[PDB]
């Protein structure tokens, strides 16, 4: 046979056979080596063996423990196969372990039954307790459906009239000789009824000697769902869909939250035939309408799409290259193929542009990140926000940016409703919508679970606040970004690019004060920020009376006319009296000339309105500049666009090394005190001032290169200041802990403790 | 004055003045006493003082610490007032503390300036560090906007031509004598430019000597947002909106997650005039269209709506009556007014009905919960799922139920788009939709933060799987119920009512195996559950061949006709040969009568098709019953509907006592070992078997009443088994901890420890 029929069935339905899955990983690892050899991320020759596989088999009955074996392919007795893989990758050359779980389409169409479910449970438990990432490939038909067959070949029917069966039947019963066979196995729950002239066993309930018929599959489905949620919280989970995912398997896919879909796949819950039976007419013609690429890639369930299974393996290893090898380690930092001292020569223009060109480049005018390092995940969903992963100097970075072009969104028709039609929606550039805000929160959550540093490029003028968007819950998804930023496990760096604006509640969302431990903000010299735009501040705070006062203060003709009116009023006050009323007549003339004075001082106040309106707008715009943001303390430092790469590289590297040593200091003090981040940073600063001196102690804040090189120097040596002081601090913490717990003891136990431990 | 003008301004705009806010709580507490005296939940007379208020004032400059004072009303220098209130409620008669935060409309329209932000920050920190609930009242105009006024008074312009100002201006500048006055205060960043014949100071930037003008309010707004998110995770937060909530305040409202809205309120992000200025025409005529009750109560941001501020205070204290007084205490259990031994006489019918009637009653045929205890929160949003709070025997319970009637949903028109029209959508009864699933997840989260027991009434046939609901992210909101059930902090009891079905992936969502520590499942005798409905299992697993085999096995005419065809086949086999071919003539007649035999055995197989289809449907329906679910282990016990109240009361009380004593056992061991729930329950069972006996040890599982009375008996006495063994295990844990932390020490340090203890 040599596994030919299983391969034929899997290839005919469109799936790589399960025991041919690991070798694909091997090939892609080899390809990465060759590409890195062309780029210079690694320089060594490719190793002879790049993958070592050990198969995990669960014990059947004792305690269902996981036993690692090496055996020939094709010997499975259940519907999933799991391996542990050691991969010798360019980013991790010594070794790196993952756990791979895959279904079997040759075994009952990949259905979910209990013995299949315990394999997933124990493999995900193994991946969680070893803290290594998990990759699941889904080829499934859903939960297992079954009908008991020993009763099916033996049940009898109680008729109203035996001559005419078409009228109806009363109950389903078993004869006594059938019950003599089936009574021991516990397949039926029955009642002894003497109807007509014979003893009959009326079937009340049907049970099976076999398992997997009914709700016992759905009991372990919730076990998989809870374990997949727990694995999402505790490790990095990647899911691949190749042919189909029906029902509960789809939920496991969404409980992975990182989904790669082949172009011929579908992720559905209810099949199209059942929906046409419910709706009564042939509404749907395929399951690709319900759950294909054009639905799941455009709503955000499927992150990336791949043409084949091998390309999906390549995308999975690309995503795995960014994350650390386990939860106790630092992110994989490659070598510097692209110089960090190079200029960033693609400047973001004021007009509408493509933000991916400022991150990658346009075959000249090189951009921010490394050449070719950029990978974006949810492209056709919520295209206002661009979310992806890249590398800066070899350091993995999560990237969020804002498209400044209008987005046309086509909402397709619903074929269940005849009146429904497709619609075109125009979405503005720099505005969070419900989908864009939910995308941003999802991206921050997914980068926070993998401990990836996030750099956000901030260009927002606010939220959407129209009636349709207020009905579509903009407040909820706006709050989810605040919660996601609050649950950050990595440094977050917000940077305002040239020509970008950060206004309104968007500043309140992305401010460093949401999570002060993990967030910083920087701005370009040509960056604007404020509560409102300039026209709104002119409407609310610099109104018509101020404009007219400005005209009477700075216009020469209005000054001279006002002086004329004042002298006329003095001429009124001096000439109070006036034969009788002889001096009256000139007063009348003066009144007309005073009407020539107040008028034509109104013609100047209407001719000069737009120019002092532009003075108002300029005066409002001078409050929005970067130097006021630096002086008020809202931003940390002003970084130019041309020198952004080097400075952010050294700052990110300094924060990574500093956070690692702060975790070591908090680990050392654990018996005595629960130490926060600030005392740990102060302790490292005190060791820095002890090692260097009081003259060079300012460089802890200013120089981000000297601190990082100092940390990498002091971490290696065991005669260093840092390691010796960590050992001394740990011993003092042990002393304080033992002192407290011996003061908490009783006088009776204390004497036993002293005499037994002084007896030695 | 006696605060008359401030009350006039607040009452004219429609808001209760801030120093009249506490007294309302007083009145409502008094009302509750009278109502409870009529019901019998309390018996004692009403206390003389039911509320004690102490005002919290932040220090201005030293460390911004909270100082508690008692002073005359009307002396605020900031726009927020905060108090700590001791309330002597019927559920908590001894005392109960909350923290109340309220804005001031009389102080700059309730705007958010930095000092107000620090009052909110420090008051919420006080509420979190005392672990007591927080109530906030939102009367706000948003973030504070400002313009520097000295530069506004004294700026000058540089003209292209001074004779004609209308052509344009070059820059905004200051004269030297103005710069001599304003140089020391740091209001301008300028450059010395000699243009024309005079020295000029070209204003590059404008800064203010005052604060609150710009982005610093947006900086402290993120501080409020992060603290409000943290307070949502750590304590219970309730928010009330009375006149308006604009901008960041709205987000704080959503970060409370429990919202009471007055009928004249609005919760908006952008005003109507700004949206009409963007859209260019008069689209909106009010802010009630963007943020009123008809939007927020129908999308789910506003939980409850109240006609006035007094009724909102009543609703807030109603919600506060369910939750415990602090995070270290057990839920308030009132006295038994309605007897727990009464029958539940409103049976849920098979037809479409109102699920509120089985929970409350219909002025006869009393329902499940207490009479009048039911309070539902989100009524007009996602009306498939009914979510609320009630009381069982005095115990607070969170309630989730399923409406079995078709819901008409009216989607209103969008005034921005001219082609938009209103739509009517029909939603089925027993199906999770995106809004219904998101409502269920929100309800489980809000009940889990308050440590309230949840009882779920499970009647679902699955999820919605059409193309429109797949595009509207059904999987995303279906996974959130699994995550919310996984993050449960309280006992969860799922019960299938009579006449209810739990089918498909809904069972996988609400199974006990998602969170086995906190979830249980029970079912009525007349309850159905399965993977699919019976017709689908007939399509998949009882097809045409099995039906025809059943006809040939159980129908008499087919049995006789098959025997006839068999005998004619034997007559074919015997007559092989056949003057020549003399016996061939009977073979033709046999062929005709064999064709007459095979036909009319096909007429019987088409006449009998519907009746054996009903036999197939009945045989499939017999697998879905309750006793199969009990025998397979999926449900815990079968509980009838008439006796559900007593049994669920005693089980819930047993779990509530047992979890508290398990937490005491895990607290006792904590120096030595981190103990899970299972060893704690086993330890309590071993103490139970030690006290009672080896014979009466089954009652730990069967009799909940005996376990309740045993735990409540030995919680009080200090000579009991439980208290003595807790002290013994704590002392042994201390001894083991000291032994281990001495064995981790160095030899030189150990000798100093020995001599310092032996010196005593």
Author numbering:
A (entry chain A), B (entry chain B): 1622 to 2199, 2215 to 2396
Question: How did the manuscript describe this experimental structure?
Answer:
Using cryo-EM on ACC isolated from a T. ni cell line, we obtained a 3.12 Å density map revealing the CT details. However, the 3.12 Å resolution cryo-EM density map revealed only the CT domain in high resolution and the CD domain in low resolution, with the other domains being invisible, likely due to the intrinsic dynamics and metastability of these domains in T. ni ACC. The solved ACC CT domain is full length, spanning from amino acid 1622 to 2396, with approximately 175 Å in diameter. CT forms a head-to-tail dimer, where the N domain of one monomer interacts with the C domain of the other. Both the N and C domains extensively interact with each other and with the ones from different protomers mainly by hydrophobic interactions and salt bridges. Additionally, when comparing the buried interface area among different species, single-cell organisms tend to have a lower buried interface, while human ACC CT exhibits the highest buried interface, with T. ni ACC CT nearly as extensive as the human ACC CT. The CT active site is located at the dimer interface (upper), necessitating dimerization for catalytic activity. We superimposed their structures onto our unbound CT structure and found that the interacting residues are largely conserved in T. ni ACC CT, with a few mutations that did not significantly change the pocket polarity. Our results show that the majority of the structure is largely conserved; however, the C terminus of the C domain (residues 2180–2230) in T. ni has elongated alpha helices. Additionally, we found that the CD domain of T. ni interacts with CT at a different angle, deviating approximately 45° counterclockwise from the angle in T. thermophila and around 30° clockwise from the angle in H. sapiens.
